[PDB]
C-alpha cells in the first residue's frame, strides 16, 4: 500500500563511532561523568585516562597508583574520581589538576570496586579482604568497616538518596546495608549461590540488577526479595563484568560478555535486541551516557581499547 | 588489576 509506514523501532541501532586507544594493558572500567562531558577509564596499567564523551578525544592521563586499578567512579559534580587498586588503596583525584587529593588506606587486599554516594561526601569500597568500607571524602578517613561477606566483594553501590548500600560477593550473596549505621538490612539468597559478580540499584532504587557467574543477570525487587526478570544468552562464567540500565531511549539492560560482544536486552521482555561486535577480548565494562544514547565498552588484554557506540533510540 | 585477570 502507498500508505504503508516505517514502524516505530522496538530495538536500538547502536553503531561504532570511535575507538579510544592508549591503555597499555587490559581496561578494567569505564564510567561517564554525570555532566555527560567525559569518560574515565581505568586499567591494569595503573592509569586512569579521561576522554571526551562525544568526540572520543583523549584528554589526559592520571597516574599515581602502584599497581593496576580495577574500578573508577565519578563524584556527582564531575570534579572528583575515586579509583580502587590492587595496591590495597583507593585514591581520590581532582580531575582538573590530575592530583591525588587523598589515599584511602585500610583494606588488607586488592580494592576491587568503589562508588561515591549521591551527596559525594562518602565513598564506599569493596575488597578481596571480604569487607566493605565507607570513607569520608573530605578527610579520607575510614568511617566504618563492615564484615560484609565471606569471599571477595565484587561490587558496591549507593541507592539514589544514599541511605542504602548494596554489595555482592563471590560468596554468592547480595546484601543491603544501612549507610548511617552500617547494619545489614537484607541478605538476598535464592535456589543456589553462584558467585555474584556485579550488583547495582536501578535508577529508582526499587530494584537491584545482579550478575552471577552462571551466564545470568537478574532484576530483583529487593523489598519483596523476588526475582522479576532474568536476562541470558551472553557468556559470563569468569570475570566481574559490569552491567547497566540504559534509560535515555528505550529501556534496555546492557552488559559485556566473555564472547567479546556487548549485549543489549529489552528490560521488560528480556529479549536480546542487539549484540555489538568489534572487541577482540572479553568486554569487561560498559557504561551508558546520562543523556544521549551512547554506550562505552572496554575490553581485556588482547584488545585494550574502549569503543563508543551511538543509537537513534 | 584483580578485575582483568
Curated annotation (Swiss-Prot), chain A:
Principal cellular location given in the protein's record: nucleus
Enumerate the residues marked as the site Important for interaction with histone H3. Answer: 86, 112, 242, 301
Q: Which GO terms describe its molecular function?
A: histone binding; histone H3K4 methyltransferase activity; histone H3K4me1 reader activity; histone H3Q5ser reader activity
Listed result of changing residue 128 to A: Significant decrease in interaction with KMT2A
Keywords, A to Z, come to:
Acetylation, Chromatin regulator, Host-virus interaction, Isopeptide bond, Nucleus, Repeat, Transcription, Transcription regulation, Ubl conjugation, WD repeat
Q: What is the effect of changing residue 112 to D?
A: Strongly reduced affinity for histone H3
Keyword Transferase present in the record's keywords: the answer is no
CDD domains tied to this protein: WD40 (cd00200)
Where, per the database record, does this protein carry N6-acetyllysine? 91
What SMART domains does this protein's entry cite? WD40
Q: Which residues cross the membrane?
A: none
User: What InterPro entries has UniProt attached to this entry?
Assistant: G-protein_beta_WD-40_rep, WD40/YVTN_repeat-like_dom_sf, WD40_repeat_CS, WD40_repeat_dom_sf, WD40_rpt
Q: Could you give one GO CC term from the UniProt record?
A: histone acetyltransferase complex
Question: Pfam families of this UniProt entry?
Answer: Beta-prop_WDR5
Location in the cell:
Nucleus
Xref: PROSITE patterns: WD_REPEATS_1, WD_REPEATS_2, WD_REPEATS_REGION
Where do the WD repeat units fall? 22-61, 64-105, 107-147, 148-187, 191-232, 235-275, 278-312
* Positions of crosslink type Glycyl lysine isopeptide (Lys-Gly) (interchain with G-Cter in SUMO2): 6, 25
Q: Does the keyword Nucleus apply?
A: yes
Q: How does it assemble?
A: Interacts with PAXBP1; the interaction is direct and links a WDR5-containing histone methyltransferase complex to PAX7 and PAX3. Interacts with HCFC1. Component of the ATAC complex, a complex with histone acetyltransferase activity on histones H3 and H4. Component of the SET1 complex, at least composed of the catalytic subunit (SETD1A or SETD1B), WDR5, WDR82, RBBP5, ASH2L/ASH2, CXXC1/CFP1, HCFC1 and DPY30. Core component of several methyltransferase-containing complexes including MLL1/MLL, MLL2/3 (also named ASCOM complex) and MLL4/WBP7. (Microbial infection) Interacts with herpes virus 8/HHV-8 protein LANA1; this interaction regulates the MLL1 histone methyltransferase activity on viral DNA.
Tell me its family.
Answer: Belongs to the WD repeat WDR5/wds family.
What does it do?
Contributes to histone modification. May position the N-terminus of histone H3 for efficient trimethylation at 'Lys-4'. As part of the MLL1/MLL complex it is involved in methylation and dimethylation at 'Lys-4' of histone H3. H3 'Lys-4' methylation represents a specific tag for epigenetic transcriptional activation. As part of the NSL complex it may be involved in acetylation of nucleosomal histone H4 on several lysine residues. May regulate osteoblasts differentiation.
Recorded protein name is WD repeat-containing protein 5
Query: Which species expresses this protein natively?
Result: Homo sapiens
Amino acid at each position: 500500500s502507498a500508505t504503508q509506514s516505517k514502524p516505530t523501532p522496538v530495538k536500538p541501532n547502536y553503531a561504532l563511532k570511535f575507538t579510544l586507544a592508549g591503555h597499555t594493558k587490559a581496561v578494567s572500567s569505564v564510567k561517564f561523568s554525570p555532566n555527560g562531558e567525559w569518560l574515565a577509564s581505568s586499567s591494569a596499567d595503573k592509569l586512569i585516562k579521561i576522554w571526551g564523551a562525544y568526540d572520543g578525544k583523549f584528554e589526559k592521563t592520571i597516574s599515581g597508583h602502584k599497581l593496576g586499578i580495577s574500578d573508577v567512579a565519578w563524584s556527582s559534580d564531575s570534579n572528583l574520581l575515586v579509583s580502587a587498586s590492587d595496591d590495597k588503596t583507593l585514591k581520590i583525584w581532582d580531575v582538573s589538576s590530575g592530583k591525588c587529593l587523598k589515599t584511602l588506606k585500610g583494606h588488607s587486599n586488592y580494592v576491587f570496586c568503589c562508588n561515591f554516594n549521591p551527596q559525594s561526601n562518602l565513598i564506599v569500597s569493596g575488597s578481596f579482604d571480604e569487607s566493605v568500607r565507607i570513607w569520608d571524602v573530605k578527610t579520607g578517613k575510614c568511617l566504618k568497616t563492615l564484615p560484609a561477606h565471606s569471599d571477595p566483594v565484587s561490587a558496591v553501590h549507593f541507592n539514589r538518596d544514599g541511605s542504602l548500600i548494596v554489595s555482592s560477593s563471590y560468596d554468592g550473596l547480595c546484601r543491603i546495608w544501612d549507610t548511617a549505621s552500617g547494619q545489614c538490612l537484607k541478605t538476598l539468597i535464592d535456589d543456589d549461590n553462584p558467585p555474584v559478580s556485579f550488583v547495582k540499584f536501578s535508577p529508582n532504587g526499587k530494584y537491584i540488577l545482579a550478575a552471577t557467574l552462571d551466564n545470568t543477570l537478574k532484576l530483583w525487587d529487593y523489598s519483596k526479595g523476588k526475582c522479576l526478570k532474568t536476562y541470558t544468552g551472553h557468556k559470563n562464567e569468569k570475570y566481574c563484568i559490569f552491567a547497566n540500565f540504559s534509560v535515555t531511549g528505550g529501556k534496555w539492560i546492557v552488559s559485556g560478555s566473555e564472547d567479546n560482544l556487548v549485549y543489549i536486552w529489552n528490560l521488560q521482555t528480556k529479549e536480546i535486541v542487539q549484540k555489538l561486535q568489534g572487541h577482540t577480548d572479553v568486554v569487561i565494562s560498559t557504561a551508558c551516557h546520562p543523556t544521549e544514547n551512547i554506550i562505552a565498552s572496554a575490553a581485556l588484554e588482547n584488545d585494550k581499547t574502549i569503543k563508543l557506540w551511538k543509537s537513534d533510540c | 588489576x584483580x578485575r582483568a585477570x
